[PDB]
Amino acid sequence: SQILASRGAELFQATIVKAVKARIEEEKKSMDQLKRQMDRIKARQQKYKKGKERV
Known part of the structure; x- marks a missing residue:
């Protein structure tokens, strides 16, 4: 167990x-x-805005 200290850390x-x-x-x-x-x-909202296009 003294030799195998680093194995647990690894x-x-x-x-x-x-x-x-x-x-x-x-x-x-x-x-x-x-x-x-x-x-x-965003794409759906822009499509709705363009469909409106016929502050």
Whole structure:
């Protein structure tokens, strides 16, 4: 157990960095999805404005 001190630190750090990688992946995906939703809303509003076109 004296020789194997660093192995536990390596394992814990690997778990932490894997969790952080999954977190940033999920965050990026959610941000892109929300941004696409916002663009669709903008496009629908612009289409309505152009359909109005016959402060």
